[PDB]
Short mmCIF file of N, CA and C and ligand atoms in Angstrom, two decimals:
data_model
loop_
_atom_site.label_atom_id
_atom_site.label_comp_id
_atom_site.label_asym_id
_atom_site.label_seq_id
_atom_site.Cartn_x
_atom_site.Cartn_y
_atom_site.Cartn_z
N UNK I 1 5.33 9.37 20.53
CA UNK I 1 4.80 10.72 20.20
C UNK I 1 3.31 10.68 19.99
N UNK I 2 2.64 11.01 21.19
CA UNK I 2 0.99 11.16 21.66
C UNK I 2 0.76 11.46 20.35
N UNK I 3 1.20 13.24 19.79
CA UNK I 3 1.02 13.90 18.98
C UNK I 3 0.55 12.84 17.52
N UNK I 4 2.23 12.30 17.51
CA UNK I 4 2.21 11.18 16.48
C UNK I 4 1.20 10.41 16.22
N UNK I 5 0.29 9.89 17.36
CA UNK I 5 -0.19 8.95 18.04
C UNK I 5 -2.09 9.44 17.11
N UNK I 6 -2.29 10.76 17.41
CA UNK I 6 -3.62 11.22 17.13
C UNK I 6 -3.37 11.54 15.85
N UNK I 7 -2.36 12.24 14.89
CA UNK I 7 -1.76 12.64 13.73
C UNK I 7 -2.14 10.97 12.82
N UNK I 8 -1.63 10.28 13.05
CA UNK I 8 -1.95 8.95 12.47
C UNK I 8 -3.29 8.77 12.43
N UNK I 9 -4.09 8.34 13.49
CA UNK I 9 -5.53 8.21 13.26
C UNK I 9 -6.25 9.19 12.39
N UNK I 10 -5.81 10.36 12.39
CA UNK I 10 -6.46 11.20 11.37
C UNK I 10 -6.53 11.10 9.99
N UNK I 11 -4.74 10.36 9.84
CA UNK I 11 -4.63 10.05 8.83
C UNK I 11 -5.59 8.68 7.96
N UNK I 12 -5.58 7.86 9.17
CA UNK I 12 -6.21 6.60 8.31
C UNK I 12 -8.10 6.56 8.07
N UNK I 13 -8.57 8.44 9.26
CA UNK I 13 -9.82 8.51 9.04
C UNK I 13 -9.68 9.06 7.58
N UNK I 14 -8.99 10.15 7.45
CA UNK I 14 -9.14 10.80 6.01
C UNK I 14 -8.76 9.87 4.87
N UNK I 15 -7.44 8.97 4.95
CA UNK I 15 -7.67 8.15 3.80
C UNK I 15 -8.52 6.96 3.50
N UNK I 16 -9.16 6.81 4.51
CA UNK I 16 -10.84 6.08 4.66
C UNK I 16 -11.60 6.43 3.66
N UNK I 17 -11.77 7.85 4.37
CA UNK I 17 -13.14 8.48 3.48
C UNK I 17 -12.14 9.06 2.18
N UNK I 18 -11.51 9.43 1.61
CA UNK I 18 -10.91 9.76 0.25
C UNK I 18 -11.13 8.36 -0.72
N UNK I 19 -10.32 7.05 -0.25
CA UNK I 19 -10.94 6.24 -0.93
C UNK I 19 -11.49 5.17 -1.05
N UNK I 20 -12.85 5.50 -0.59
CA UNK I 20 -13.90 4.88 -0.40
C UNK I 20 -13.97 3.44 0.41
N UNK I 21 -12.89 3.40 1.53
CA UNK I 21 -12.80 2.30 2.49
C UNK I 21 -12.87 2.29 3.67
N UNK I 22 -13.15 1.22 4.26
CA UNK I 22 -13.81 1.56 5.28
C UNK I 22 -12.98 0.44 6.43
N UNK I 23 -13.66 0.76 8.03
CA UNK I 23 -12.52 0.46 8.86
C UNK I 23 -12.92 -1.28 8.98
N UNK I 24 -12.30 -2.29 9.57
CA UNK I 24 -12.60 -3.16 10.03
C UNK I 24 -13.47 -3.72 10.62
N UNK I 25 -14.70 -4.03 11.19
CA UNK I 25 -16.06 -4.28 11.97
C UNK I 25 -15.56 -4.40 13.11
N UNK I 26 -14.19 -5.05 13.66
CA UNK I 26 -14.12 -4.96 15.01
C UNK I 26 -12.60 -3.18 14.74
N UNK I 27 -13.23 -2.98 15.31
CA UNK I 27 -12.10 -1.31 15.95
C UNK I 27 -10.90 -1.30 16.41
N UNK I 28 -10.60 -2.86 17.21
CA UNK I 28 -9.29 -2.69 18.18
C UNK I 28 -8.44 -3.68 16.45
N UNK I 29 -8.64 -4.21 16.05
CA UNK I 29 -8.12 -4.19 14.95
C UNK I 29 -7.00 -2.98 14.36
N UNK I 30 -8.42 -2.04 14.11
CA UNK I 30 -7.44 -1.21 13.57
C UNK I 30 -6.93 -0.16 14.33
N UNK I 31 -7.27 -0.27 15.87
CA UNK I 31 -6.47 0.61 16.31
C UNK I 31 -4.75 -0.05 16.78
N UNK I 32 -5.14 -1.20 16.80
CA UNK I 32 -3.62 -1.71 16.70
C UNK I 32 -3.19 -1.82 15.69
N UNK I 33 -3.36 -1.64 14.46
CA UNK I 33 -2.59 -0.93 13.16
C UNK I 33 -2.11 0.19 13.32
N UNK I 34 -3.02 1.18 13.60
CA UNK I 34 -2.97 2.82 14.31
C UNK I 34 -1.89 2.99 14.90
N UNK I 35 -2.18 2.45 15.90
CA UNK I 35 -0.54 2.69 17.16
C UNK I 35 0.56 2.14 16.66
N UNK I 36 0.55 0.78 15.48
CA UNK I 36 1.84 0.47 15.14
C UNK I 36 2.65 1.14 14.28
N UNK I 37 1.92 1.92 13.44
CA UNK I 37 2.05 3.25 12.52
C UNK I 37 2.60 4.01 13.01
N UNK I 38 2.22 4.60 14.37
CA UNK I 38 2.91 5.94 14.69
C UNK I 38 4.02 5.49 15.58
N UNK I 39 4.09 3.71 16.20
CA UNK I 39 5.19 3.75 16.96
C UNK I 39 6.42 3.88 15.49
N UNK I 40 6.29 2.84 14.61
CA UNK I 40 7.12 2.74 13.56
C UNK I 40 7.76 4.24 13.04
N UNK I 41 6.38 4.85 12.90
CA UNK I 41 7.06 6.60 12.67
C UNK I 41 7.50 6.93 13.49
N UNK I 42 7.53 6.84 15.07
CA UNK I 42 8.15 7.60 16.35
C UNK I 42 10.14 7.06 15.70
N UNK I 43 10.03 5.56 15.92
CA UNK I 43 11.21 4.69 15.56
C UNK I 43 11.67 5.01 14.54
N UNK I 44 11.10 5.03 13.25
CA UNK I 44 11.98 5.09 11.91
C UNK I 44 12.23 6.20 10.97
N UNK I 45 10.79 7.08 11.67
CA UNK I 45 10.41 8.89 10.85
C UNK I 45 9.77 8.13 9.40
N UNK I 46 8.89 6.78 9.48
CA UNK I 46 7.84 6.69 8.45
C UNK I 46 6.94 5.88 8.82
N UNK I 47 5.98 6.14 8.74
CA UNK I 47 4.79 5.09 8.55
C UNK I 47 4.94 4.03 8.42
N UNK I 48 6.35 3.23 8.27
CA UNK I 48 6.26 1.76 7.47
C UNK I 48 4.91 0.40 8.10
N UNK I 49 4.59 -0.03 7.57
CA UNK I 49 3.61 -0.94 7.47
C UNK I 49 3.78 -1.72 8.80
N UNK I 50 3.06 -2.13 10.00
CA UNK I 50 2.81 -2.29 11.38
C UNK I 50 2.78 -4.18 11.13
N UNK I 51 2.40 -4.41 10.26
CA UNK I 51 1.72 -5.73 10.15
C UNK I 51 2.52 -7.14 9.14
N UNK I 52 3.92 -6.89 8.98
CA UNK I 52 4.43 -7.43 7.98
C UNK I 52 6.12 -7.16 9.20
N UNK I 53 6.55 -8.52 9.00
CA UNK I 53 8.32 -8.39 9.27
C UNK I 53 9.05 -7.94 8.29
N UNK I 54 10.59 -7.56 8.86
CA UNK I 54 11.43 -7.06 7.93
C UNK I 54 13.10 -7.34 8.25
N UNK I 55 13.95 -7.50 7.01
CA UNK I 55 15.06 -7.52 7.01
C UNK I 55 15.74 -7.12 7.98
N UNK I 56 15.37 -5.42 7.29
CA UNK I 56 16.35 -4.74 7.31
C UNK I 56 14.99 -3.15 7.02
N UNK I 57 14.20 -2.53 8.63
CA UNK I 57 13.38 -1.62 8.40
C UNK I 57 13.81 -0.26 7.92
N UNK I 58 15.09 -0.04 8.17
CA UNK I 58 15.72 1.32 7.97
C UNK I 58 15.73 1.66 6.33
N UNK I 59 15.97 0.19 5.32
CA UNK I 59 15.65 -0.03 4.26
C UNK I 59 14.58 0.68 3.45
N UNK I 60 13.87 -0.24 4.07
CA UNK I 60 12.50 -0.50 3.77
C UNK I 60 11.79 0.89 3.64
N UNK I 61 12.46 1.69 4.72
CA UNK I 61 11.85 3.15 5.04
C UNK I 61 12.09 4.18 3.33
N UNK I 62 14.05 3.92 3.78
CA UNK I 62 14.14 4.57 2.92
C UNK I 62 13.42 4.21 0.82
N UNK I 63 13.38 2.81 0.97
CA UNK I 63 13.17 2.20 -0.53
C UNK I 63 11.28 2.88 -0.71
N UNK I 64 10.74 3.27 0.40
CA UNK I 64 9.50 3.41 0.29
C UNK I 64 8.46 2.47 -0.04
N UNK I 65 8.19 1.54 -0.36
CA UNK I 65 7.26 0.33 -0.90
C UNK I 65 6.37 0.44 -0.07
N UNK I 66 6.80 0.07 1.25
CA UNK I 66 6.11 -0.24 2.26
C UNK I 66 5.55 0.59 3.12
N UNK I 67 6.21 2.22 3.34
CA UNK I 67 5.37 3.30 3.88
C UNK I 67 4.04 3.36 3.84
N UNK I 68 3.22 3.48 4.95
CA UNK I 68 1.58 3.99 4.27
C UNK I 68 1.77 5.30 3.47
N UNK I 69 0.46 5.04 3.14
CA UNK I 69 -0.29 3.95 2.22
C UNK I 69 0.70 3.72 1.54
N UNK I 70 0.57 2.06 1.42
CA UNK I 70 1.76 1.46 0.32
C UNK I 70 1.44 1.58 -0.99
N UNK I 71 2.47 0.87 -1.38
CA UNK I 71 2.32 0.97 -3.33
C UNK I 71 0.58 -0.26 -3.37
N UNK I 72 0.82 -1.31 -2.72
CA UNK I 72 -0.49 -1.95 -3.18
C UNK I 72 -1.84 -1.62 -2.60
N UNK I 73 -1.91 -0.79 -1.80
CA UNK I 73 -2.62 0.27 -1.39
C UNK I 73 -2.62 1.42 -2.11
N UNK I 74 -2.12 1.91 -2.64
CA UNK I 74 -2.53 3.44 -3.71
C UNK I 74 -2.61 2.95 -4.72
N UNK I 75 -1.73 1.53 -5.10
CA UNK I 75 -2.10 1.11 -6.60
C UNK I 75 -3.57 0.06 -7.04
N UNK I 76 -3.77 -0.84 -5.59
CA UNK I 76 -4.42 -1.50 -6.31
C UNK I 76 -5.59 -1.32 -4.95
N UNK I 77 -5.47 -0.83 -4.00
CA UNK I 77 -6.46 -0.75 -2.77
C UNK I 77 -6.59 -1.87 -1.93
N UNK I 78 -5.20 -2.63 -2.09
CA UNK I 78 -5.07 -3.98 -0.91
C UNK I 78 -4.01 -3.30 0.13
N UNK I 79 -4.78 -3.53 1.18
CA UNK I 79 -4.52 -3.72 2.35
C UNK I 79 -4.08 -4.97 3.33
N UNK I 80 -3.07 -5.20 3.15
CA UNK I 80 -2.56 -6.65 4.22
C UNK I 80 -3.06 -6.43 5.74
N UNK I 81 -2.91 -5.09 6.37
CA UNK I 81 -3.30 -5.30 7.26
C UNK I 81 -4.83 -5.13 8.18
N UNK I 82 -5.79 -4.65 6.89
CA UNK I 82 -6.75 -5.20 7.22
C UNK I 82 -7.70 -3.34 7.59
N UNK I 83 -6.78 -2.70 7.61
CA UNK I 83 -6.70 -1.01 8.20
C UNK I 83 -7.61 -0.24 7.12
N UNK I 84 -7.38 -0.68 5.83
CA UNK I 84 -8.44 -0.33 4.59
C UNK I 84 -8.84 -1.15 3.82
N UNK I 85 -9.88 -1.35 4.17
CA UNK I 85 -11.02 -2.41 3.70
C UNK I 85 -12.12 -2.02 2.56
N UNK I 86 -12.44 -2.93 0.92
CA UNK I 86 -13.28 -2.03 0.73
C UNK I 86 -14.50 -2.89 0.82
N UNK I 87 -15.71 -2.27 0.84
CA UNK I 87 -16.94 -2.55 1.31
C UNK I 87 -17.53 -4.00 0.69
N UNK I 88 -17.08 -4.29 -0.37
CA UNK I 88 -16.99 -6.20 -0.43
C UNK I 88 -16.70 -7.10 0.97
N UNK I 89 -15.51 -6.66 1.71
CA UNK I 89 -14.70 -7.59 2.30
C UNK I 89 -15.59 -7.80 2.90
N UNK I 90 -15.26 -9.33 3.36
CA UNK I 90 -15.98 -9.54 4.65
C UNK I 90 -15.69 -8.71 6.05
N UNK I 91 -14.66 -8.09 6.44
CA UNK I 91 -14.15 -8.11 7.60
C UNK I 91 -14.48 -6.65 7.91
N UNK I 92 -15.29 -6.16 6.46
CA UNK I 92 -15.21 -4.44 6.69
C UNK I 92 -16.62 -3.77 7.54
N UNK I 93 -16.17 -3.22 7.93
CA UNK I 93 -17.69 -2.97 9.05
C UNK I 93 -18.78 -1.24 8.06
N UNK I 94 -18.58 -0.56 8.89
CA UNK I 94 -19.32 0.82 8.19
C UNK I 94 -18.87 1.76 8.47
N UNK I 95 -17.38 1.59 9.55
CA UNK I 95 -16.84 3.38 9.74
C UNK I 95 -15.68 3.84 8.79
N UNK I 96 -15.73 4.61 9.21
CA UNK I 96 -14.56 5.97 8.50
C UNK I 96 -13.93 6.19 9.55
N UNK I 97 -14.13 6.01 10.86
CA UNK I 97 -14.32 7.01 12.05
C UNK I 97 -13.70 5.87 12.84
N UNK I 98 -12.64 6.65 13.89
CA UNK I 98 -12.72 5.20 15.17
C UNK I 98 -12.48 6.60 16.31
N UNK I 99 -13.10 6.33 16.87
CA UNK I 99 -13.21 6.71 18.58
C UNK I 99 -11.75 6.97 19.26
N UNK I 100 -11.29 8.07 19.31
CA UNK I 100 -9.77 8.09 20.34
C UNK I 100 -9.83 7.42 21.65
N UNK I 101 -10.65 7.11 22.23
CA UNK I 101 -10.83 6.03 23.48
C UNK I 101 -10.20 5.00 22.99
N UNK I 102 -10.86 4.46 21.90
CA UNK I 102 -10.35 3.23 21.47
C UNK I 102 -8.47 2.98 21.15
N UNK I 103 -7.95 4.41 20.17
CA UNK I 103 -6.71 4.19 20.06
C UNK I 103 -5.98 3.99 21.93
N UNK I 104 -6.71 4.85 22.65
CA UNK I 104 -5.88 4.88 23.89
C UNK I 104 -5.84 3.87 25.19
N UNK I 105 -7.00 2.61 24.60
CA UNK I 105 -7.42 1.11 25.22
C UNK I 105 -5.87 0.59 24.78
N UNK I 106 -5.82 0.54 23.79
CA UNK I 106 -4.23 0.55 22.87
C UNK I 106 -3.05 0.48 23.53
N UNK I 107 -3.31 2.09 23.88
CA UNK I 107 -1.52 2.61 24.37
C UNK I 107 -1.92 2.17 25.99
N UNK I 108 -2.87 1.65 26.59
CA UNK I 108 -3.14 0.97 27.71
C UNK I 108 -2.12 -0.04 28.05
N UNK I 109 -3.12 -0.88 27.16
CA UNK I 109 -1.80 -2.37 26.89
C UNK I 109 -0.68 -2.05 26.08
N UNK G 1 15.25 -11.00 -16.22
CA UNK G 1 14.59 -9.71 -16.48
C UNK G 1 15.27 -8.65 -16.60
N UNK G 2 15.20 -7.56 -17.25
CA UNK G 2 16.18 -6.70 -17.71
C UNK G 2 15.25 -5.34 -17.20
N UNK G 3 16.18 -3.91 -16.77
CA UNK G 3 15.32 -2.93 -17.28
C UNK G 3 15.50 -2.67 -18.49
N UNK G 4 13.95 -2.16 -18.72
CA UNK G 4 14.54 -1.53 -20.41
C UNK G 4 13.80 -2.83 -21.37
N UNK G 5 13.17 -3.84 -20.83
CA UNK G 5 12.44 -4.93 -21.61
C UNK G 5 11.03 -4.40 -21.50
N UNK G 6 10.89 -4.31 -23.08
CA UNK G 6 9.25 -3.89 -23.54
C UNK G 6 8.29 -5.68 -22.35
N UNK G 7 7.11 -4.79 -22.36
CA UNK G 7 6.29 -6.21 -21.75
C UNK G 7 5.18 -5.68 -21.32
N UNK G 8 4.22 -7.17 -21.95
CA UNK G 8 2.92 -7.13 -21.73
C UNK G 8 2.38 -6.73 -20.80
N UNK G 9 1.31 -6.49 -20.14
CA UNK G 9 0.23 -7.37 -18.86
C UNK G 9 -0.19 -7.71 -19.28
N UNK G 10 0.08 -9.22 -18.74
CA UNK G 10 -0.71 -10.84 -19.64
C UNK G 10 -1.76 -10.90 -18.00
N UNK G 11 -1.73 -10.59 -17.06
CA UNK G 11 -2.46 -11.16 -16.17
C UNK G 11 -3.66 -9.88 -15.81
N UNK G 12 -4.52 -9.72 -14.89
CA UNK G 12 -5.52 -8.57 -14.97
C UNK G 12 -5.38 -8.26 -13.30
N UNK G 13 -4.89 -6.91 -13.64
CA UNK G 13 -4.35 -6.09 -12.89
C UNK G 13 -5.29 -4.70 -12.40
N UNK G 14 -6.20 -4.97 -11.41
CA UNK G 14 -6.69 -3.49 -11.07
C UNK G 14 -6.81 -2.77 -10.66
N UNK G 15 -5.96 -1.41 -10.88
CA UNK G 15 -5.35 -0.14 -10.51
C UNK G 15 -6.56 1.05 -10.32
N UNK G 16 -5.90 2.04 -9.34
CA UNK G 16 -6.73 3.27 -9.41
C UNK G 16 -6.03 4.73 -9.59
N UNK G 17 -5.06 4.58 -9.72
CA UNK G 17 -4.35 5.65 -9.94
C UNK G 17 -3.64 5.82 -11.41
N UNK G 18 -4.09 5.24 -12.10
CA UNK G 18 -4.25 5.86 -13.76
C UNK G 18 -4.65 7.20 -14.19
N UNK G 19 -3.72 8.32 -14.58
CA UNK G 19 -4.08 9.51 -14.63
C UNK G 19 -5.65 9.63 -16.09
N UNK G 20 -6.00 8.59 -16.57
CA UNK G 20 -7.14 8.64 -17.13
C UNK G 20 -8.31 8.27 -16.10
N UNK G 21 -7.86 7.57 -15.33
CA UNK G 21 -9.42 6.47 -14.25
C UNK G 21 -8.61 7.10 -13.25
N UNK G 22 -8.02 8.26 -12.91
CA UNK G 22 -7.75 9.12 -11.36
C UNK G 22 -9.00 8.17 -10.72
N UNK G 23 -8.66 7.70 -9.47
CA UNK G 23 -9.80 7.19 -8.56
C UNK G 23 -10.56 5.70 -8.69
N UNK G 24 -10.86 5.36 -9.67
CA UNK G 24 -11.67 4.15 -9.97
C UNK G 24 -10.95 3.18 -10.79
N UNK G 25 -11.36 2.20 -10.71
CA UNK G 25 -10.64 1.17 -11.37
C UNK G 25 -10.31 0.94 -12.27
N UNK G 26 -9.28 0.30 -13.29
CA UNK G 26 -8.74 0.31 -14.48
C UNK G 26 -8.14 -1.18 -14.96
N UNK G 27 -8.62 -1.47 -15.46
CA UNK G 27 -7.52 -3.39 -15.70
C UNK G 27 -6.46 -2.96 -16.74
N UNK G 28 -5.02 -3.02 -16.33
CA UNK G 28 -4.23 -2.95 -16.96
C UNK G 28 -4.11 -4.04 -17.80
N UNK G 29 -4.53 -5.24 -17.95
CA UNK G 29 -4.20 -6.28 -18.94
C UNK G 29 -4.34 -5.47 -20.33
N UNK G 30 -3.41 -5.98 -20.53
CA UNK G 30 -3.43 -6.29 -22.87
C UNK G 30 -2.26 -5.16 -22.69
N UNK G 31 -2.06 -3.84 -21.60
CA UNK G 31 -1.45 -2.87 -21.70
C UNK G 31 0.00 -2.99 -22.18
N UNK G 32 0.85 -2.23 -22.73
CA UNK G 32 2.32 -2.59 -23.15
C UNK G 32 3.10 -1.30 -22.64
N UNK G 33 4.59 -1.69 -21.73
CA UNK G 33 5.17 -0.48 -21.36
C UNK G 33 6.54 -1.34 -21.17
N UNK G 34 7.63 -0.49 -20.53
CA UNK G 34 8.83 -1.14 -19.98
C UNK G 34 9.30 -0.78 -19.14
N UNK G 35 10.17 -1.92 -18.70
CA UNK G 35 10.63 -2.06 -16.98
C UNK G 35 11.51 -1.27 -16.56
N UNK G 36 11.27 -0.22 -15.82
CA UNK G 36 11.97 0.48 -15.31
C UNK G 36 12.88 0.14 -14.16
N UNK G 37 12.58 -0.57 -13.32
CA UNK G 37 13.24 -0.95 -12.12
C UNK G 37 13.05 -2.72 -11.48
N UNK G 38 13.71 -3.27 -11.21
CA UNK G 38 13.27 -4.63 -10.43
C UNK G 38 14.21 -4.12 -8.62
N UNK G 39 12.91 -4.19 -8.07
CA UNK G 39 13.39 -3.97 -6.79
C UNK G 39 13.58 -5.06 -5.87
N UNK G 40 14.98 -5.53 -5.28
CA UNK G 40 15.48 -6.36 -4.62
C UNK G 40 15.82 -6.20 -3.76
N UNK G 41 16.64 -4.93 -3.75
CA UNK G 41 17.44 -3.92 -2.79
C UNK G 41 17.83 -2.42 -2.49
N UNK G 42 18.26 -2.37 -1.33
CA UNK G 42 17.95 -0.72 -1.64
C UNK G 42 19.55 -0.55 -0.60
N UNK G 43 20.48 0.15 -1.74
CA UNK G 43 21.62 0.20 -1.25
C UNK G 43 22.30 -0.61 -0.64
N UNK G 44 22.10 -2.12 -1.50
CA UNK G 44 22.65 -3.63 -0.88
C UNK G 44 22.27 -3.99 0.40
N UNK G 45 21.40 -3.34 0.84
CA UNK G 45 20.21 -4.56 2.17
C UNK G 45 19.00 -4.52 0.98
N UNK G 46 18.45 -6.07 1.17
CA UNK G 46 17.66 -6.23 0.70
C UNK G 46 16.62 -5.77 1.13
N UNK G 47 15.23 -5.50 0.35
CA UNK G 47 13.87 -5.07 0.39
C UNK G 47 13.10 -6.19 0.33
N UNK G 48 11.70 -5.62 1.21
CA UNK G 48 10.73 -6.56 0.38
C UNK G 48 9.81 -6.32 0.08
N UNK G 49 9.96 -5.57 -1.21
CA UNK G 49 8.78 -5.10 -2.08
C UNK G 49 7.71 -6.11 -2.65
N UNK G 50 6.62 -6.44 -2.61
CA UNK G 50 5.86 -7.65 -3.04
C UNK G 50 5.28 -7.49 -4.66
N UNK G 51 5.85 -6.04 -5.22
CA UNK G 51 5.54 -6.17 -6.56
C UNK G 51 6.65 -5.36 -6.93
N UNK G 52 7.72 -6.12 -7.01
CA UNK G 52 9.12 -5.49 -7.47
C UNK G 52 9.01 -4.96 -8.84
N UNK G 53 8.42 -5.27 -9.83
CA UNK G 53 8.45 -4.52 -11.49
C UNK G 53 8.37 -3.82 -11.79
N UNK G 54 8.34 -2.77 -11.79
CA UNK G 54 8.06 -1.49 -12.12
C UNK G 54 8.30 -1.08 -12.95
N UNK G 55 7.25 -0.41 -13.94
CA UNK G 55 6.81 -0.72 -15.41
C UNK G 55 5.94 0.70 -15.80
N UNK G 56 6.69 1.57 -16.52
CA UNK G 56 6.21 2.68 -17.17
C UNK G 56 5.84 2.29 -18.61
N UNK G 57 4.68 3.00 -18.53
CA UNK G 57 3.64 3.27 -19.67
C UNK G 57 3.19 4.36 -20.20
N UNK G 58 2.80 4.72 -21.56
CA UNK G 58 2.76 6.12 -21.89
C UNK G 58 1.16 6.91 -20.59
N UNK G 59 1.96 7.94 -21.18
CA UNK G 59 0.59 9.22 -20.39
C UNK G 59 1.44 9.09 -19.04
N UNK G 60 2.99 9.34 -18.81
CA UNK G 60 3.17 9.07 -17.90
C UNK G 60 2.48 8.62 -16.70
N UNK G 61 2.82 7.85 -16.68
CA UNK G 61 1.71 6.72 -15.99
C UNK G 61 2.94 5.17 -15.51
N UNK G 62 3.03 4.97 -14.17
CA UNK G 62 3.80 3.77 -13.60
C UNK G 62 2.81 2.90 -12.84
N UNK G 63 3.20 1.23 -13.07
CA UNK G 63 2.73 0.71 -11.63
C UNK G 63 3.74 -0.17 -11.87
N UNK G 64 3.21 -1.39 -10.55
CA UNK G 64 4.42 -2.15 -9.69
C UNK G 64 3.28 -3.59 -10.18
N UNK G 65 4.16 -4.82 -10.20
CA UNK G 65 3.91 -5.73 -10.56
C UNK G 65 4.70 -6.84 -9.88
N UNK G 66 3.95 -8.27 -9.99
CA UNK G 66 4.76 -9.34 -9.75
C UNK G 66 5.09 -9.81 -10.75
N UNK G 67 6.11 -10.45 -10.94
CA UNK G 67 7.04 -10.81 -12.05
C UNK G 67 6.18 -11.92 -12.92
N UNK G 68 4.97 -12.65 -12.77
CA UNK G 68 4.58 -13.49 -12.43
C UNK G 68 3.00 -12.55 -13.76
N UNK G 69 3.30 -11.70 -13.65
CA UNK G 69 1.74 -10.83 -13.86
C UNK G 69 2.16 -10.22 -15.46
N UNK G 70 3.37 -10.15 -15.74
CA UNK G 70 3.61 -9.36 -17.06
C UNK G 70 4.65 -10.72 -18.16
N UNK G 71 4.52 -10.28 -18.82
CA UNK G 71 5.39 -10.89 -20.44
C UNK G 71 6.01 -10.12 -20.79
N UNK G 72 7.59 -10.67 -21.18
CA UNK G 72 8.82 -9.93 -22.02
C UNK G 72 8.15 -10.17 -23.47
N UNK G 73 7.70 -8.86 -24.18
CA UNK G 73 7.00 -9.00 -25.48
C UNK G 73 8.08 -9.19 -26.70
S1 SF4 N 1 -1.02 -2.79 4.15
FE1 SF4 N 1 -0.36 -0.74 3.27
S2 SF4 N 1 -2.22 0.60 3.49
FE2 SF4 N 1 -2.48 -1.21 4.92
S3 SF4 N 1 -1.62 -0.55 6.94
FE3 SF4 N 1 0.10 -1.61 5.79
S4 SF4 N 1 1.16 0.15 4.72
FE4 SF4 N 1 -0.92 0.95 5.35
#
């Protein structure tokens, strides 16, 4: 779901800029977070986390932990997969913003 | 571990969603509340929550912990 597909990126621009994190320095990073987000939501009807294995995902969906933004993401602002970064990290570059070209280099490969 | 066991944060924990620090950071250490939930499973398939504890504190106010991060007081 394309729809799905641009709906997500919006999401991870706005919870960027809400709290105060920023995207990865390299882009295809997080646009392959991006696309794994909305395939997981196409598959499961949640956000669950792109970057971590699982049991049992249907679980997982319903127990919530792991939905974006997760619990250690709204609670403590860690990010495992690297998608919200805050401006300490090394790995964090200066956007808020990623380019829809870029999500669709993505759905390329 | 029990629910329903009063307990510390012995370790330093920093949160942003404290309805006093809405937004910015907060160290829960020294704080005292009790365990509401240990999450293992969710309708007998297991989960994998990475801070299963879950631990209410006054000012309604919850977070999630590793078992590893709080004291049975
Ligand atoms: S670690 Fe949490 S905030 Fe980061 S992409 Fe996974 S679910 Fe989203």
């Amino acid at each position: 779901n394309n729809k799905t597909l641009a709906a997500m990126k919006n999401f991870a621009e706005q919870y960027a800029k809400r709290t105060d994190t920023y995207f990865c320095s390299d882009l295809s990073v997080t646009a392959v977070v991006i696309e794994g987000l909305a395939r997981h939501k196409e598959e499961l009807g949640s956000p669950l986390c792109p970057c971590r294995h699982y049991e049992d995902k249907e679980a997982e969906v319903k127990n919530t932990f792991w939905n974006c933004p997760c619990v250690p993401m709204r609670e403590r602002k860690e990010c495992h997969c690297m998608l919200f970064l805050t401006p300490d990290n090394d790995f964090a570059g200066d956007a808020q913003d990623i380019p829809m070209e870029t999500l669709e280099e993505v759905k390329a490969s | 571990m029990n629910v329903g066991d009063r307990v510390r944060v012995t370790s330093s924990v920093v949160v942003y969603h404290h309805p006093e620090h809405k937004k910015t950071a907060f160290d829960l250490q020294g704080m005292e509340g009790e365990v509401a939930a240990v999450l293992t499973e969710w309708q007998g398939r297991p989960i994998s929550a990475n801070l299963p504890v879950l631990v209410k504190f006054e000012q309604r106010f919850k977070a999630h912990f590793r078992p590893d991060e709080v004291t049975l007081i």
